[PDB]
Amino acid sequence: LGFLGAAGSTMGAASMTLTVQARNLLSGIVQQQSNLLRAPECQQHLLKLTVWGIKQLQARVLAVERYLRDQQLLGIWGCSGKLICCTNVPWNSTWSNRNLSEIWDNMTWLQWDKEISNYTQIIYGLLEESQNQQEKNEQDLLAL
Amino acid sequence: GFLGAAGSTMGAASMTLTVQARNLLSGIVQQQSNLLRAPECQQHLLKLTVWGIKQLQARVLAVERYLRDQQLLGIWGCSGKLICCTNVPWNSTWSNRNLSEIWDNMTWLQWDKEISNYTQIIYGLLEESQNQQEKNEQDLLAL
Amino acid sequence: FLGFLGAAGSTMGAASMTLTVQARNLLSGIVQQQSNLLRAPECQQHLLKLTVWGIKQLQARVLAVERYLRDQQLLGIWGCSGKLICCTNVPWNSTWSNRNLSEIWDNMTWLQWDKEISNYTQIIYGLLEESQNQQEKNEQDLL
Amino acid sequence: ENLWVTVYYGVPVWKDAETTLFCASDAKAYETKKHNVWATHCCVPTDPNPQEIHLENVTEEFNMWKNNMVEQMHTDIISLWDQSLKPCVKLTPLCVTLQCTNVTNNITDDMRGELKNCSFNMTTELRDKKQKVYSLFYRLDVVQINESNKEYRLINCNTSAITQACPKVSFEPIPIHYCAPAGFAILKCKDKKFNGTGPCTNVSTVQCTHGIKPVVSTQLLLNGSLAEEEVIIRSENITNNAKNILVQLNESVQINCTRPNNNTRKSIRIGPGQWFYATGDIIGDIRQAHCNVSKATWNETLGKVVKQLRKHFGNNTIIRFANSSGGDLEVTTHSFNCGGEFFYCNTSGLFNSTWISNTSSNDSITLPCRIKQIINMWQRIGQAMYAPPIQGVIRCVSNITGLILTRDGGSTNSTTETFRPGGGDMRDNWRSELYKYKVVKIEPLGVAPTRCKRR
Amino acid sequence: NLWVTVYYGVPVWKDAETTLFCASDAKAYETKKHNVWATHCCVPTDPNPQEIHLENVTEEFNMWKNNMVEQMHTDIISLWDQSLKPCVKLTPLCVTLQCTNVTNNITDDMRGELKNCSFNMTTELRDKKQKVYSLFYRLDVVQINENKEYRLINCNTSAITQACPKVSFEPIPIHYCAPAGFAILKCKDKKFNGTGPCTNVSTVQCTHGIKPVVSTQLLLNGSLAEEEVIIRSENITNNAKNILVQLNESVQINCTRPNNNTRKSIRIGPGQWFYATGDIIGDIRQAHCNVSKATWNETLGKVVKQLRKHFGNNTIIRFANSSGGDLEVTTHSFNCGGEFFYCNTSGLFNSTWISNTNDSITLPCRIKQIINMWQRIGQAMYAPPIQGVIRCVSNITGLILTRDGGSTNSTTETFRPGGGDMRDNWRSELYKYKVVKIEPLGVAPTRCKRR
Amino acid sequence: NLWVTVYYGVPVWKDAETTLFCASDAKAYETKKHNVWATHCCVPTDPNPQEIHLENVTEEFNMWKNNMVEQMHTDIISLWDQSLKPCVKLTPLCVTLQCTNVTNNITDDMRGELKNCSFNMTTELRDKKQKVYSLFYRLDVVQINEKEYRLINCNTSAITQACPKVSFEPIPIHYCAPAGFAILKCKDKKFNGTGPCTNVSTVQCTHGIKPVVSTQLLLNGSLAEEEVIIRSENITNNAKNILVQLNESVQINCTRPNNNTRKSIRIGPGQWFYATGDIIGDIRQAHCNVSKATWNETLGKVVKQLRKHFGNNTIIRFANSSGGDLEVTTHSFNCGGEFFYCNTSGLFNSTWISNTSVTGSNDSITLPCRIKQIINMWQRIGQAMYAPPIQGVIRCVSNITGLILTRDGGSTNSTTETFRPGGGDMRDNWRSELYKYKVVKIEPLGVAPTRCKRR
Ligand SMILES: *[C@@H]1O[C@H](CO)[C@@H](O[C@@H]2O[C@H](CO)[C@@H](O[C@@H]3O[C@H](CO[C@H]4O[C@H](CO)[C@@H](O)[C@H](O)[C@@H]4O)[C@@H](O)[C@H](O[C@H]4O[C@H](CO)[C@@H](O)[C@H](O)[C@@H]4O)[C@@H]3O)[C@H](O)[C@H]2NC(C)=O)[C@H](O)[C@H]1NC(C)=O
């Protein structure tokens, strides 16, 4: 039901839960601070920065950057803000020889992204290329 | 007039949404327009570690707040919009006040107190609505 | 393969191709270098012996994040969030540059063009932000 | 006609909050050249004018005794002050079995026994040399050890080591502003004669506070700001007489404080770049450092204060000003910094007059002031600071803009109420001038109903 | 003809690592009363810890090479060092120390152990010395001769520093918590043994309350197995590995330093105070521990029964005490009340238990004040004395054993104390958890493309 | 009618200041377990980064305004200070020494070079001293006018000894940019240090520049491509130093031929003084050999290049250094864990009109070199580093790759343009290698006209 609750479920059954993981992907900081409100002793007993000082801020900025890198990696393919969206790239049987009956059902996401690990950078590049083409075309289409 | 319409009722006040929203993390530009506040400020921050961590903490908290709000707009499908209708009806449990009574004869501040225990519920409902909408879009692409 | 700045010498029109590389580097470098910092040595215990090293490095990292976030906001205020090429309703001024399409997009690199109209940049931005507001205004009138 | 949720972003809603406010000031031309510590700190400019946007139809609940803003800046000045002090020479070698005698070099009757000529082998930080060293001290800084003459130590020695404040750093009170980071705002109360709590009628938003000079003082508030056309009295609890009491004045009172002694310095080499500044001889007749205050100005001012007091405690009640109680010089006297030196002035010559229902010149009040070179800054245990001597005669001229009081009530009879100087806690020094202000969290996101629906 | 779709927020993860952040109970100031684990773990826990069950999810765990243990090690050393850095230094407290054995209502054993030692001390003023005395334990002081000349042991290689008074190292249960983008997976396989994919796994905001307990050769104030006794070892057949043993019952131990102590607060420098041991108010007795004998017997019975498994059916099993070496590894070292107890465990491990073809056990204990904790990293931390009498009551929840080199003999497999690597003390809890990083973004095929 | 359009990802940049990443090779890291460079610059380099040639690009460079060398200077001094931070201080040693001439199997040139000094040191016990002794080099000892000796800076500077286990041996370093920044590398052959560069390529990290410390000559450096290159901020203003990069290295075989013994004496708890034990064998001066013919040939190259800027009717002479402290007077370096200081007067003794004015086919120039242990690193007064002695015999071999020269004055057309050794500025030492590189901030955003407008 909750965070990662559909991890063992099939990809089709876990296609919507994306929202819960999404919230956590940032909202852990809310668990770290500002809802787990910093105790009045914070920064008086964390003047000793070497313990739980700099390192906590490292963790926060690293989480922020993971979020930004992924968000930019989405937007550079288009589909900014959308959990799910299609693209104009057809599926290569090289990456995976599996059916929707075998993909959306019968198998979990962990299995899936393991089974298509080595090709990840391939597909991403295609999406990037696709997005770029569209934008340029539209501009000239809008000029004509 | 940043916050100049705070006492104004909602109807007039909503004309200053651009005015307020423009100031979301204006330190993203102002601090950069302050040349990182000085060369000497940079020297001070490195020399005295305490204000280093303090001022750095301030900046990262501001960025985190910015990004939290932006994600909350995104998950509702309301990215880049000052205003967006969301396909979630209004409950009389939340406010039984007349539409005239809410958009006039009433300020935003009073309204924030009026709905203090329910905003998060509305947000969850918005999340659910946008989720269903995106799944509908996927199915429509399939069909 | 082009390279990160491979298009710098390519003509402006040709250089407009494959802007994706330079957009993505600003964060791909952050994540890749950070991974190669944290573990590939496993010496953060040493690097953090000196407070000043941590303050310097952490400031630099958040500054890179801030720069990217600054650009994202300045695109959003122009309605350019989520696009690498985006047009507006502002007509060009010969005051900024009188050259024509051939004289600009051909036999010219982006460096020369940047030097040509640097001192007008603040003008254009104003117009751009100004422009976006009216579109929102019209939408707000539909709303 | 039916209503639907709609997201409203850019909403001018706010909350009270606590946060990391950052220091800013007039850049000027850095003419202090990083000598004064707050040209190393607060170097971000406040040069643009404040925004000053009226919050029409808005009334805001302020409470200056709950101003956390005060707390952050108080902590900041403490931390900065210690951090400035730390990278200097440690005078811990000077904590020795000291031999002292009286000076007696053309000394006035008032200053008999105040100054001591002291000497001992002391230290060179070169192994087994023991080069003799002598200097001058004020009696407050030195204490007998046992029941030549007597064995003496520095007063600090039993408490902690002592650090010498570097001569290259100044603590002059240049004004500062406090500016909010992004997402926050400062609200400034313009309701004149705001008594310190409750709603404020009309208010502006700003990015930064006005220029506040973070002066250190104990009883009198110096180089401050004045009230709006009327003396004002403020207190967390008027009823309870155990609370500190804030007096803000309509007119400033000039005070001319002086150390008239034409003194010199002795440079002593302790070690490799370790240098100690010892108080040298005094050229000329040795007199007492003291302050002249316009007597007529003081009595007129205190009449105005008495009227304001009567507003709360009745205008047929009898009011008296008496001196402070006993205790260390840090709380009993009016203490302040004059160009680096630390004056400690007997204010009993000020708070002496009595008032009755009367209706149903160049003479100066003299305040003798003691000079103390060991300072327990911020009332800290340990962390002692050695104020180095300063050459020549010093004259500080200052605006008294207010002060602190504590009340001895009439108890059973409830006929006479007596007032004595108070303070000593710099939180109260801040709160006097920083009382129009409140940090506010901005929350630009909200929702509301509307007939319009999602398209 | 299937098309590419991008999915953001996928519930997947990979093995991951990061500085987990502390979460204390923050129940009251009395637990924040100058204790490092609460004063410096400023962040509290969720009052209601949450746990999400993961249906049909199998996850590999390996309690060995588990990063979070190393994180706890780095954190204890860092918190310790920074806590005890701003403290009074005893570095000039090295002179010829003149000692004589104390004998005043004393146990024959304590003879020599305790020792009166006259001394030349520094004062607040640089130019004066003062003659003082203090009692010392023989473990602290070494004899130097050409007969009554002595020094402190560590003074030839390291600087001696007091622990700050009114500072508590009393362990407090800590919840290690995952930052944003990360998660903690908790394994609940009964008899998991510490390695392999867990049959049932559940994501959790933070680990359960782990007390950073310092115990040697055994586990104190830890968790218990659900049934029987769990044996854990990275390589059971390798005799150089430490066997972690987790019980499903706790063993009762009462440890005590009976002597009624007094203390002198001497001034050595400006603001520098030294805590000296004054005369003992009561009699002189040795510290010791009472272990429930029958409980210990049945405990070792369960342990040997579980040991016979995977070591041969009806194989003969024997117990023996530790080897020689330095006291921190040969004896049960631990902290009670703020003082360091060094107990002879030889009365616990003995005899054979094959058993086929009430009462209390007393363990004497020495008291040591100067401590080199970890691998000589404490750098002569000097434990200040505590006035009065010291008593602790504890649960042994696990044992650290090592098998002898009996592989070539194939008979009478002999187990001895182990330990000395404090990581084990936390492994025995941290086996239950693993750190992972969410990899939210992925792709999959679909029936449709962009219009 | 052309219309505004905003592009993101634009290939443009600006000059800037930032912070870079000190990365090193993994092999030199793991082998050099306790070296300062390996451990501080722990970040591994890219095993094979791709350099991006900027086809059809022109970029300007000015290696005298390069922020990078300043940052490297700050970083290296910081690292040096950090390495010595936990090591023991030698201020307890500052005691009068009872010394004699060692007089034990010594060649004629080294007589009076070494002193055998006895003294009283602190023990592990603060109430006990020990009579100990060690040998010293004469540059590290001064006489009292009244056998009575002290160190040079016994009562002037804070002295600290290097910990025995740490290594300062240079290792190749790469400097990597942060995100939003790239490094532009000028590859044009015979780049004189200023102006446009045709052959330029973009890089993530520089090549393995080895951070050698040096004074006059540039060691273990990089070479020019075809011919010797002479570079100077102003060719005629002799106020500026002149940098020489050779196109062929020169081998130097240098040594301290003295089988020394390192003794370890306990100062206190965990404090060890490291003393020079009795030498095994005879005592000979340290020295550096260089090939005579190779030397003159290199000088022929450099005069050939120099003549471009002064004319081929101009006499060109090389003389030895002017007076001053040893640290710039000699050529100094720290190969082998001890600090050599070499008399370069044998070098730079000639005049050049038509090649050299002066067989020696097998002749080699032998520079004598003093040793010393207390070092005023970076020419800072009041602080110093005691090198611990190294047991055994020191042998080192090095590639000279460049020089630092300066010109005298004298207003005359019949001048000889006297060149002399210069340097002593670590900045100049860096600048010799890191000149081909500049850092640039990438500004991905741009705006242009177009055929396209928003509908
Ligand atoms: C320019 O670059 C050249 C490159 O060769 C440098 O020349 C050599 O530099 C090395 C420095 O590492 C010289 O000395 C070497 O030092 C090592 C340090 O030993 C440490 O470990 C022992 C362990 O007990 C300690 O006792 C000791 O005090 C040190 O702490 C030695 O271990 C090396 O010897 C080993 O390797 C050599 C490699 O050939 C073997 O031959 C040896 O048998 C042994 O296994 C080594 O002595 C080295 O001598 C230099 N070369 C020559 C020919 O002398 C230049 O220094 C450099 N110059 C500048 C200005 O940058």
Ligand SMILES: *[C@@H]1O[C@H](CO)[C@@H](O[C@@H]2O[C@H](CO)[C@@H](O)[C@H](O)[C@H]2NC(C)=O)[C@H](O)[C@H]1NC(C)=O
């Ligand atoms: C609160 O009200 C007072 C008036 O009672 C305002 O005072 C005005 O200040 C401005 C400042 O330039 C003057 O121009 C006006 O003339 C003043 N008013 C009058 C009636 O003279 C004050 O500004 C108000 N405060 C805020 C925050 O708006």
Ligand SMILES: *[C@@H]1O[C@H](CO)[C@@H](O[C@@H]2O[C@H](CO)[C@@H](O)[C@H](O)[C@H]2NC(C)=O)[C@H](O)[C@H]1NC(C)=O
């Ligand atoms: C572990 O497996 C058991 C089944 O063998 C699961 O069932 C029970 O879950 C409850 C949840 O409160 C536990 O208290 C019980 O101990 C479990 N066992 C039994 C026999 O009831 C359990 O859910 C699994 N754990 C996880 C994390 O998936």
Ligand SMILES: *[C@@H]1O[C@H](CO)[C@@H](O[C@@H]2O[C@H](CO)[C@@H](O)[C@H](O)[C@H]2NC(C)=O)[C@H](O)[C@H]1NC(C)=O
């Ligand atoms: C390089 O140095 C030369 C002199 O060494 C400079 O030429 C001088 O320029 C000033 C400019 O006012 C004149 O007053 C002097 O008379 C010139 N010197 C001579 C000898 O004629 C030259 O300007 C410098 N150039 C740069 C780029 O630094």
Ligand SMILES: *[C@@H]1O[C@H](CO)[C@@H](O[C@@H]2O[C@H](CO)[C@@H](O)[C@H](O)[C@H]2NC(C)=O)[C@H](O)[C@H]1NC(C)=O
């Ligand atoms: C520089 O000094 C060297 C000696 O170190 C000179 O070489 C000697 O020159 C004299 C000249 O009369 C000869 O007699 C010696 O035989 C030379 N000895 C060597 C070492 O070769 C050298 O000549 C000097 N420089 C110049 C150009 O005169």
Ligand SMILES: *[C@@H]1O[C@H](CO)[C@@H](O)[C@H](O)[C@H]1NC(C)=O
């Ligand atoms: C779909 O399923 C059938 C039968 O299970 C199988 O033969 C076929 O290979 C599957 N297709 C893909 C693309 O995996």
Ligand SMILES: *[C@@H]1O[C@H](CO)[C@@H](O)[C@H](O)[C@H]1NC(C)=O
């Ligand atoms: C540089 O100019 C040549 C001239 O023909 C051209 O072919 C080349 O493409 C240009 N470089 C780039 C990177 O476009």
Ligand SMILES: *[C@@H]1O[C@H](CO)[C@@H](O)[C@H](O)[C@H]1NC(C)=O
């Ligand atoms: C521990 O396990 C044994 C196994 O038989 C069982 O008898 C005993 O009751 C268990 N202890 C507890 C406390 O459940």
Ligand SMILES: *[C@@H]1O[C@H](CO)[C@@H](O)[C@H](O)[C@H]1NC(C)=O
């Ligand atoms: C200079 O070098 C050349 C070439 O090695 C050699 O033949 C000559 O004898 C050397 N001496 C002179 C003439 O400087």
Ligand SMILES: *[C@@H]1O[C@H](CO)[C@@H](O)[C@H](O)[C@H]1NC(C)=O
């Ligand atoms: C060398 O002399 C010739 C003689 O004409 C002259 O042309 C040339 O410029 C001179 N070169 C130099 C570098 O002086």
Ligand SMILES: *[C@@H]1O[C@H](CO)[C@@H](O)[C@H](O)[C@H]1NC(C)=O
């Ligand atoms: C060079 O000679 C000219 C005359 O030919 C003279 O004016 C000038 O001063 C001389 N230069 C110097 C540097 O003496």
